[PDB]
Amino acid sequence: SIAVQTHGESMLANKKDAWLDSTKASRYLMKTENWIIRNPGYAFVAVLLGWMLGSNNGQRVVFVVLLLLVAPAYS
Amino acid sequence: SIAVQTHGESMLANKKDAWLDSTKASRYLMKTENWIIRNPGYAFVAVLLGWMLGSNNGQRVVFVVLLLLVAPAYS
Amino acid sequence: SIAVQTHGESMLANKKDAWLDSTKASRYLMKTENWIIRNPGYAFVAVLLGWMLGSNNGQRVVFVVLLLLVAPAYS
Amino acid sequence: FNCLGMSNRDFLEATWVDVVLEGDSCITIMAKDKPTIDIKMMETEATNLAEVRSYCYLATVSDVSTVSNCPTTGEAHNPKRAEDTYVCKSGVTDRGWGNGCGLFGKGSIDTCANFTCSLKAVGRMIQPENVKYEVGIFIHGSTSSDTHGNYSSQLGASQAGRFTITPNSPAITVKMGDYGEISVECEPRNGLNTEAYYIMSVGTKHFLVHREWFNDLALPWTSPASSNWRNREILLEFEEPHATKQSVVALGSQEGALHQALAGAVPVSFSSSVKLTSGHLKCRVKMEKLTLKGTTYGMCTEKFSFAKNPADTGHSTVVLELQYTGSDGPCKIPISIVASLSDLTPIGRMVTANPYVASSEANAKVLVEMEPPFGDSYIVVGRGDKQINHHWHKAGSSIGKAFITTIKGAQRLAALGDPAWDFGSVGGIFNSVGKAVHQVFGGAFRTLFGGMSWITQGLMGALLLWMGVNARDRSIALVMLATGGVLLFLATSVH
Amino acid sequence: FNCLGMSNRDFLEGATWVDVVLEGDSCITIMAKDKPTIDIKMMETEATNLAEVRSYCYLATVSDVSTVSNCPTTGEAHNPKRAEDTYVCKSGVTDRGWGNGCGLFGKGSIDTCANFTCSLKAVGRMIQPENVKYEVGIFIHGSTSSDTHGNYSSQLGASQAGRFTITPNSPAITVKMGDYGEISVECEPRNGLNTEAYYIMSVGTKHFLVHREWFNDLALPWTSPASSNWRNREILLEFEEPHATKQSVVALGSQEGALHQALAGAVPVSFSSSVKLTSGHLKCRVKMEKLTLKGTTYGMCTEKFSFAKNPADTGHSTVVLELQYTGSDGPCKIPISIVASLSDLTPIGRMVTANPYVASSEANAKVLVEMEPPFGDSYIVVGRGDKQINHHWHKAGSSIGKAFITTIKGAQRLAALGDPAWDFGSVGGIFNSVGKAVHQVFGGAFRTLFGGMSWITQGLMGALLLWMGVNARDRSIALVMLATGGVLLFLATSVH
Amino acid sequence: FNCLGMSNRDFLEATWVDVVLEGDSCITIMAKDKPTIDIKMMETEATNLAEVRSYCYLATVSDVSTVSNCPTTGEAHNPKRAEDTYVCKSGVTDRGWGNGCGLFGKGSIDTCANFTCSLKAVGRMIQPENVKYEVGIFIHGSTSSDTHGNYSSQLGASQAGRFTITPNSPAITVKMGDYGEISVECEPRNGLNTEAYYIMSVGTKHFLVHREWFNDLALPWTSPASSNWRNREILLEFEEPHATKQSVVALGSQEGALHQALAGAVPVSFSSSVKLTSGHLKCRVKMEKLTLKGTTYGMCTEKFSFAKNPADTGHSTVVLELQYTGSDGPCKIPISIVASLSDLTPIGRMVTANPYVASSEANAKVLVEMEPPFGDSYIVVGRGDKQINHHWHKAGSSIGKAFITTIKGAQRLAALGDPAWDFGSVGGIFNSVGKAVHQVFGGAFRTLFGGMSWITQGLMGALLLWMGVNARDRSIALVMLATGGVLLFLATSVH
Ligand SMILES: CCCCCCCCCCCCCCCCCC(=O)O[C@@H](COC(=O)CCCCCCCCCCCCCCC)COP(=O)(O)OCC[N+](C)(C)C
Ligand SMILES: CCCCCCCCCCCCCCCCCC(=O)O[C@@H](COC(=O)CCCCCCCCCCCCCCC)COP(=O)(O)OCC[N+](C)(C)C
Ligand SMILES: CCCCCCCCCCCCCCCCCC(=O)O[C@@H](COC(=O)CCCCCCCCCCCCCCC)COP(=O)(O)OCC[N+](C)(C)C
């Protein structure tokens, strides 16, 4: 749908507020946060898969963050 | 918005089409494909970074897919 | 207002006595005195754990003092 | 009440049987020494719905005012902030000697706009006591093609019954004439999980929606029988402050946005009661008192003709309509499926158990359904010089048949979950223990992957297959491969 | 035209010309040695003759729905309304049998056609570069009171201000400034508003400057400027459950709110009859070789002054005040200065109202004086002897903190204006042009690799880049990753 | 405007001196060839106060109502929840067939009560341009005991002056008759940090409060010129729910709890304007136009007597009052301090420089005060038959005086911070470098330990001393020891 086609940050200089700048943080996060609060059990499996995939803790953390981001986005 | 808060597949057993089933495949994919084809240069970033922070071809492909999916979402 | 939010010492240069300076030495320690008085068993157990947590003797003393101070302040 | 011409049809073969009636499906039961039964759920109905919450999706703005204070006068206060229908927001503007202030910097403004809802979507809830299931039962007696789907005629012949299953009437027994009686006892409280759904009404469209989705809807909302709106600021936009008048606009109608968000919800009909065609109902069909006629009529000896030529129904059965020119009376119809005309031994199974002409009027029409075997066979009607032979080919094989039923059973497990083990069940121990394993494992599965869509299910399953292929412990590998296969099956089966 | 009381202003120190970048709602104050102080700002920009490029339908209706049905194994149905342009037609399949009216059983094809009509459409128009029209205000500080400093009519009657039009046809003009001389500007309106990355989208009474790529990718039924035939109409239609004779088609609800949600980030503009907005940038060159001081031979005022309006802080490390003159001497210079202490009266700081003076000869004349004191304590002294009046003033910050603030302001100016940022307050030189060019190449390499990203994605990318660079090798890839991560995090935080 | 009779007093020696006019102190300057000067700050005054916030400490509950719904109907909504002056809370309560419900369980109630503020504490802001400091200057001319302290008589002798210092008049020159002119330039914007304080008025009591503390009260509060109270339910208690009526009570008056929270704030008087006597004001006293009086008259020839016997002040000075019996107009008093009666060399400097009789009538009283050296000395007036001697003993020593001066400078550094380096400054470089290195290590110190109290400061100082003595690196050990010593000194100096 068109609602997912957010215009985004404008290209002008614009020392002012854009159309819906009050939602500049509400956007991009609200779907993810509601999905995570209403799917707490996915966090456990994402964390453990991130642990198992990553050779090192630096890779494990990145895997965990990426798994926690992708599933709420495409669900 | 609210169209970002899309109702999922119903839990009812339904041998019938849901409310908007013509778009069932395209709802979760239009943003990703549009963003990818409008930003071809991000693909090289994704492949290069995923090839770097990985340790073998097994998790490099997972890193590339995860990065190529996380960025079209959240714009 | 909430009486635990005492204004405290002003940074204004003042040689008089501020509001209620008859209680500077009592408004920070009155709650703690009654409480150690009414709960000697906590004093005993605080001494025990302070001794047990301290590899060194000064560490033991510091732990005992902190344990004796924290609990009365938080009821 | 019967299923000839339905695409979703099931066939079932100690004296009762447990069935799950799905919304757009039918079940055909052929027991050992019983007439054939057709059972289906036509419709679910809920009569007394109670409003829970209304969401405004179109609102207007009618009176915008602004009040200002100089950078050292404190927060601005607008009088309309003491009125219910006004939404107020505090902003910051540039103030200085040009405007009239005594100082420079950020002065404080307060803007209030009158809020009025034009169009709202109303949510309602269903009590389980008010759910009615419409269930149709049919006995394959003597019917014609036009009579076969006419309930009035089938009721007048004591071959069919339509009844209502409610929590206060979970069991019925319908009279089937000389076939006896057939009973059902159902579990209405387990059918429609009313505690998981709301009925949304947007304009003239009505949907069955999840309660968790409905509660998270980001719109201004009000309680039943109240005009006090909450979260109104979602529908309003305050543009740039001006320090004397800051404009406030209302966003456009969110009806299309709501319709896009409602994707996946189940459309329903709600004029006075919610009508619904999906869902499921677990019942037990009791055929202890159901019997065959107990008398045979004697062969029809006159000439037969095909009123409707044999036609494939699509479910491995062939149906035809005979016309009888005789006028002698009720007689048994000579009709069978044979392997060849040299050996007239019947080989198939008869859906119409004992076809017969029910009336004594000439030119009677009788519908007969049969299950021929795979390959070539012959429909034989009559004997001697009046015999009509019709060659029938049935494509497929028993191996492909078993494969297709395995796929269909897997899809039934996916769609129904736990009552899938109650489908065609006769109370075996294996069914019970498998049902319990399904309880625990599916509960865990819904705990871990419950909220996922099909694309994320497919990606997660692909990851799980990759991890199980390269695993090490060979036991965690087994379970990860299993859950990956399940996730791939769920991802693929939705298309 | 004037920037006093404006929350964001830039100070430029003057060498006969200086090139500035006028931003949307901002002003520049230029002080030059032995020159009147000037301030210049872009008041607005305009576009006059726009042409429609594309209409999108966001509210549509269905008029009459027909279904043509075929029996099983008879092939596709082909509703005959597929030959009419206004009808949207979809092919489905439904259960058929003896009960329906077929001689066979199975899936029979149907074709449903519904008459499409657009009720409400959003119109996107383009701007031709020759029709852009910038409004520029210039003001010589001169002698003003507090009540006429912002009044354009008074400042025009005093030949101390002028608002004028910059057009690609006439990119350079000169304003007469009375006894101050002439002030010239040569601008680049063509290099201002891009005009090729933007459309003006009108939805109802709301108008937005939007990116062309976003507008062209919008997932709504669309048409051509004068066309009445629509494409991708199935976006706004829902074909309900197939039925052997009557499949129902429902128009979706109005998408106006969904469009407003999608417009999040576009720049609101006013389009009563021409597009107007106050949000762009314009590179100009201010030439002031013909700008001269006025009243060089007035002589100092002799009577006593009084603070008519007490010294107030403007928020830009500057102080404004208003004096009243008891004397009727005539046009005379005001003896006002900033001193470190009331002993050792040597002047410090810098007047922003250069050479403040009393304009007229009548008494009780009020003069606005605005100056920049140094950090710490200072005294505003006007008069000498027994008529001297003093004001104690304190400036809170420090030189190093101001340097850091200027550094972050320049960084965010680079983030906003990109390459024109080097054109800001420059006088040429091998440094600025080389720096500008390397900024151009790095900006291209950065926009082709990380463009089209929101603040969250670029913040997470910066976090990843910092992590990898800290853990990297070769000390050369690591520097690149550190730089990119730092820039990405700065950009992510710059929108908050 | 005099230093006499004040327990706080300091003594100072090109021709300008930097002083800090502390709130309840007095400064005596004794330059080389100038009359003795007494300078002191008398009262600070803020004129036009602007309200910033009002806190409620006494609330009223007027009209309480409750609305209840059945255990599954949905959240209740009181019709009063829209109205502005009503505080409304949602509770949950047991419901069943005995309560009128068709179901059982936890139903929802909504309770609304009318909030009203009865008593309010008002915070106000001071603009630095409205602060004015009253400063008193006095010259030790010829005074009596009663007139030394009467401004109406010292001004009439051109020996004193009260002047107001504002940001718009930061420098004042006052004529002193025959002594010339004494001028002062001050820094009124640095005296009272109005950016860090509010004036809180509760009842008839007024306080100078920290802005952070004032903004952090947990009470219902409004904006200025508004009755839109918020956080109202701070003063409300909702009793146990009953589904038909839930009681709401107002918590008792918080005036006393507010007084207890105000501990450490500075009381002020705010009848019309805010008047204060604490604080400080940094000034520069210019004495170049200050000259010793041109005195043509000779010494007094007649007999003197001690009208008031010599008295010891608190600051190593002696004050006495002489009675002059002669009537030969104004004349100089032959009074001095000697080590012994054989060596009449004047050894002790006199604070009342060049004392003299001012009147011409007989029996004139003259106040003379002076600084004798440590140990025994004699105040001698006259010679020969008219000579009168008085034995004075001044207890103490130079070492003890130096140590007391050091500790008093320590308290000065504590009280003033950075302006303490400008006290008794004639410019210099050590003063400026010390002030610069005190601006740092004085902001960092108040960043790490700014908000502590005396008991926390003492505990932290003891811990830091222990860590420093137990440390290994001498640099970190020394810095820990220094910060611990400072913290203990500050913990101790409050008593
Ligand atoms: C050597 C390699 C082995 C390879 C393993 C192969 C794995 C086979 C499985 C994949 C093939 C496809 C299977 C799909 C069947 C359909 C399942 C289905 O219908 O989905 C369930 C999904 O539920 C499950 O079946 C849960 C998954 C369980 C997976 C079992 C893993 C067990 C591994 C154990 C290994 C360790 C053994 C320990 C001893 C060594 C939906 O129902 P519920 O979740 O119960 O309820 C909700 C349904 N509804 C909304 C429609 C009402
Ligand atoms: C130990 C040291 C490490 C410290 C790292 C910390 C991080 C520091 C980060 C510093 C950045 C501060 C922010 C500066 C402002 C830039 C913001 C910006 O706009 O982004 C630039 C960022 O510029 C870049 O491209 C920077 C790339 C960084 C990577 C380059 C590293 C250098 C490698 C050279 C190696 C040479 C070989 C080795 C020889 C020694 C590109 O965008 P623009 O095109 O300017 O966007 C303007 C808007 N508009 C397009 C609409 C006009
Ligand atoms: C072998 C040597 C042993 C060393 C022993 C040292 C022991 C000294 C203990 C101190 C006792 C006397 C303390 C008197 C000083 C009081 C000054 C003071 O309190 O000033 C501050 C507190 O003090 C400070 O802020 C400074 C403390 C810093 C201490 C650490 C110094 C580090 C020293 C480094 C040593 C380098 C070693 C080099 C050798 C290798 C008070 O508040 P301010 O912020 O100044 O002003 C607030 C008041 N007003 C509202 C009016 C503005």
Ligand SMILES: CCCCCCCCCCCCCCCCCC(=O)N[C@@H](COP(=O)(O)OCC[N+](C)(C)C)[C@H](C)O
């Ligand atoms: C070592 C080499 C690799 C080895 C690979 C081994 C292959 C593993 C995969 C095999 C999966 C087979 C299908 C299992 C899914 C269940 C389908 C099913 O149960 N199907 C049933 C028909 O279901 P119904 O709903 O009609 O009723 C039956 C009701 N009840 C089955 C629920 C009790 C029958 C058996 O078909």
Ligand SMILES: CCCCCCCCCCCCCCCCCC(=O)N[C@@H](COP(=O)(O)OCC[N+](C)(C)C)[C@H](C)O
């Ligand atoms: C051995 C050699 C190697 C070592 C040398 C290392 C130093 C070179 C690296 C420099 C990296 C700096 C990046 C930070 C960006 C901030 C720039 C900034 O803030 N810009 C300016 C502010 O100026 P304006 O915004 O007013 O506009 C002036 C226009 N202008 C952008 C051309 C200056 C500040 C004063 O700088």
Ligand SMILES: CCCCCCCCCCCCCCCCCC(=O)N[C@@H](COP(=O)(O)OCC[N+](C)(C)C)[C@H](C)O
């Ligand atoms: C191997 C060789 C070395 C061996 C010997 C080492 C021992 C060194 C001993 C250290 C001696 C320190 C001197 C003691 C007195 C110094 C000053 C003093 O005490 N005066 C006080 C008077 O404060 P005021 O209120 O007058 O402040 C007015 C202005 N003012 C703040 C600038 C002072 C303050 C505390 O400074």
Ligand SMILES: *[C@@H]1O[C@H](CO)[C@@H](O)[C@H](O)[C@H]1NC(C)=O
């Ligand atoms: C404000 O809105 C209400 C409905 O929300 C309406 O009844 C009223 O007339 C409007 N105008 C006012 C209160 O002036």
Ligand SMILES: *[C@@H]1O[C@H](CO)[C@@H](O)[C@H](O)[C@H]1NC(C)=O
């Ligand atoms: C059933 O048959 C009767 C007999 O004529 C007829 O009136 C009725 O309409 C039939 N049922 C339907 C649904 O047409």
Ligand SMILES: *[C@@H]1O[C@H](CO)[C@@H](O)[C@H](O)[C@H]1NC(C)=O
């Ligand atoms: C079909 O729609 C078009 C476009 O709105 C309209 O002009 C035409 O009259 C409609 N025709 C019918 C039969 O509805």
Ligand SMILES: *[C@@H]1O[C@H](CO)[C@@H](O)[C@H](O)[C@H]1NC(C)=O
């Ligand atoms: C509620 O309280 C307000 C004051 O806060 C008062 O004006 C109003 O009359 C009260 N309403 C009642 C008592 O019904």
Ligand SMILES: *[C@@H]1O[C@H](CO)[C@@H](O)[C@H](O)[C@H]1NC(C)=O
């Ligand atoms: C000062 O002396 C005058 C002279 O009589 C007297 O009237 C006045 O009351 C005195 N002031 C004080 C404060 O004693």
